[PDB]
Amino acid sequence: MPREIITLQLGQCGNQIGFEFWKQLCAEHGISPEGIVEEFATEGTDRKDVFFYQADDEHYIPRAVLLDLEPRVIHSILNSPYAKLYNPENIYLSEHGGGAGNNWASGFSQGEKIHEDIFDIIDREADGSDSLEGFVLCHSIAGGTGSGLGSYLLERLNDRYPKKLVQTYSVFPNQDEMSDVVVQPYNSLLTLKRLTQNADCVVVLDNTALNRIATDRLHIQNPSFSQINQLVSTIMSASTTTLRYPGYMNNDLIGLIASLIPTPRLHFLMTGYTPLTTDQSVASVRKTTVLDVMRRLLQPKNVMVSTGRDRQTNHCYIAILNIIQGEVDPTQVHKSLQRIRERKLANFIPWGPASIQVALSRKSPYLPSAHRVSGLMMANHTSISSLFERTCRQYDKLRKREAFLEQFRKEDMFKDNFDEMDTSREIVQQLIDEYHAATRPDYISWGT
Amino acid sequence: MPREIITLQLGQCGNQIGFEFWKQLCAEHGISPEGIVEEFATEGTDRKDVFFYQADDEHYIPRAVLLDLEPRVIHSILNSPYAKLYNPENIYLSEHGGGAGNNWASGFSQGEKIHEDIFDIIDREADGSDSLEGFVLCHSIAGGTGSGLGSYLLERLNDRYPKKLVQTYSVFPNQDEMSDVVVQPYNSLLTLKRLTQNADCVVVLDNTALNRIATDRLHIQNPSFSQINQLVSTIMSASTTTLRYPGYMNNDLIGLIASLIPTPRLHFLMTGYTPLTTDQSVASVRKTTVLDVMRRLLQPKNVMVSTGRDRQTNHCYIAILNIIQGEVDPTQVHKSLQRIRERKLANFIPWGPASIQVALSRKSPYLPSAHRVSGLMMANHTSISSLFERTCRQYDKLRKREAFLEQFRKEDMFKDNFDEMDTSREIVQQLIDEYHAATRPDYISWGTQEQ
Amino acid sequence: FILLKPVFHCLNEILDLCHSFCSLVSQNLGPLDERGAAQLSILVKGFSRQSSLLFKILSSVRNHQINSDLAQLLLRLDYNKYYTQAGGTLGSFGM
Amino acid sequence: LDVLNKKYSLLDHMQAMRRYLLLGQGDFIRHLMDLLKPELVRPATTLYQHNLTGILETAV
């Protein structure tokens, strides 16, 4: 049976991302806005049962759970044409609509308040899943609902499904913009805490990186939230193509991520996408070779993570997996790997075996691909610590400034102290340092 | 990977020379003014990656940086058909457009003011080079912008790229024309200082010799700057031919020049080109022999440097490299070298082994050649010191006349003293003396601490 | 590599060692007991020896220029040259 | 002669020998030697044929 995936959309940002993801998945699978397979979608070669459930022999419903503490966004999703695609029994909307007030502690307390309802929804969805692998949480770490409610949900999923895998698609706040949410580092700290203790792998999605890519690479002067969500949904689709087009390898998400996380702490993944094109640059179909494809992928402009330039730590890639979709000549892939090693385009960990994994994947038959060849890069790169170090610095700056803690002190989770935020900041600092060690040969003795 | 070459075009004259050089390179490689390879440019035998980068799958962009302190010339270049040939990120135009006012000190101060931005542009271009050999600077030493900014750029390149080679195409002031720039000898002195301290190779371009050749050799009654620039572009093309026609030897600029520069101080090269012809004489394909080629190259009337007849110093050729392009029989080359040696047509240094190097080169297939055979001469000749001696005499005349020093005292480089000019004069005097010493068998101990 | 009888047999032994290691890891939910630790040490030594044998085989084939594809596989394995730095032996599992 | 040229490219094989085996592609040889310098300086016992072949292909 397929490894079913529950998609959890948390808070305003998480719910918007989930909605755009479900829209993109429906479009890629030729699923009507009601969840019905379009008559043209005769190629039954996609594996919907991994991420979607069938409502009937013809209608595929996404295994997605949309969670918000404010009713406005959930109602706006339910007011879209795609309202009927999702199973309504998997949709929990907070009646109070008040949100978490951008308070992580409030979001966590709300999760605790909706614990019974949320776990009933989760159990109902689990019974609808024949071979549920786990849950995928889409949320922001800076707000209250997506951060606090997301952390509460992660805690309760870990408690209820301690033997089940928990993957997250975690949208990190933009670090280059001054956040008006002074307590965002507290929210971010609590989310990083929950990812550290109860998640096995955290995929960091930096809104700063999204904005930077949209401006410099997509040539979007004012990137809308919708355009970023559509880029993220496209990335998720590309990441799930190998799940939807079964082959010899990487037939499951857990099988895909197992190779990336050598140690429980080394769960920070970097992403890459191919072909990467500016919205304006669709015009010229470049006869890119697998070597040419990988070369463009090896360009930092094509990496889906904007890691800061750490000057002190010789950050390196711990591991790289390239999932390439489309017409690929294997000899061109081999030459690409040869050139990458010869050109030393990627530095790998010195303390263990590391390579660039290359996956060749079929495209979804239900989604017409404008590109002959597409590719995802998954990489473990120590430069992600520069994002993590920046988050740690922001956490320390907020705790040292007690910024926005008075609003958190109103909530029981943060009423007496911010010790959970300080411990999270210390853990994130240790994580950055460990990632720097993993860039070093002494990673072999790291933790000894 | 190819040894990439970054082309730096400095000031009005340098930028014009660079633009004409890029035009000539495009013509030789069959590159359109838009940067697209012409359909006829099917001979993939040229190494564009030495001097050009591919901007797209179709567009090859020269690794050339066009730098001017006045916006008029840069705008005129950007208004040319070749506007799309150059990387727009490699075009720096001073917003003030005012130039350096023909003041080396002003040019240097402006270079210091734009040092960060210029070096950021340079680093951005450098990261695009897989195996960058070094930078080539085209500038004049007599003006303010190309001279002062050239010295600033040389200093900053030496600081930032201390392991990279620095070759220059340095336009030296006309020694036969009275310069209106009374401080040109000061500008020339500062430029020579930087060339001695911060350049690794200086190609001397004397506007006096260029004008003399244009008048006497090109039969131009009133030589335009454009005709001089076209001669310079021909010279640069010949200098890049070994990059454009890869072969068994001298396949890299450092590999090519290594045989020519025996000592770090002996880095002043003289050039020769052959055949020099007026456009009208294309008609008759003369079956020129290698011996005939070398003989015509050996004529001082054909030398692209106007050295005076020094009667006091027995100036001699230190080394000769002949780059010959076209149909050449190697056995004819051997017999020609034998005959040249037998005739003792050139005097060499007595203190070390010296010979005439001969390079045979193919012509560009993308550029139709009106001449079956073309040739470059590279020579080290002690009479080049007389050019430096003449510049020194002009420097001494200006300092003794305090000419135009009030404009330099306004700039910090000359505000308190002219010690940089005096040190440059002393270094140039030592250079002249060593070149005279290098003409003698006692050159073996020239420059030795015992000496 | 089905035709490479000595290589095929060495690979089969490596695969069986991997299966035994996976069984040992599956049997111990917690830290390895003394028996589990001894089995782990034996497996580590076996794996390092078999990977050194693999590297030796690859070098012998290089000397014989017999198979490009085996060299490609070895190159893929030693992409970070970790195994090359480890001398072709599978890296010591740090206990 | 026609058969040798069309089916075995005998003259083309000789021209290839000139360009590559006779080091006619001198830039290629230069770049190869530059890449080999860190390898050719190493002890010969430490050379991996796979690495040298990959360097050769990369230089090509």
Coordinates of C-alpha atoms in Angstrom, one line a residue, chain A residues 341 348-356 444, chain C residues 72 76-83 85 94:
Chain A
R341 CA 34.1 16.3 -9.0
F348 CA 31.7 17.4 0.8
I349 CA 32.1 16.4 4.4
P350 CA 35.6 15.1 5.2
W351 CA 34.6 12.8 8.1
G352 CA 32.5 10.3 6.2
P353 CA 31.6 9.1 2.7
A354 CA 29.6 11.7 0.8
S355 CA 28.6 12.2 -2.8
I356 CA 26.1 13.9 -5.0
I444 CA 34.0 12.0 12.7
Chain C
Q72 CA 32.6 4.6 -12.5
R76 CA 30.7 7.4 -7.4
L77 CA 31.4 5.7 -4.1
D78 CA 34.5 7.8 -3.4
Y79 CA 33.1 11.1 -4.7
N80 CA 34.2 13.0 -1.6
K81 CA 37.3 10.8 -1.7
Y82 CA 36.3 9.7 1.9
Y83 CA 36.8 6.1 0.9
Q85 CA 41.0 8.9 2.1
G94 CA 32.5 5.4 15.6

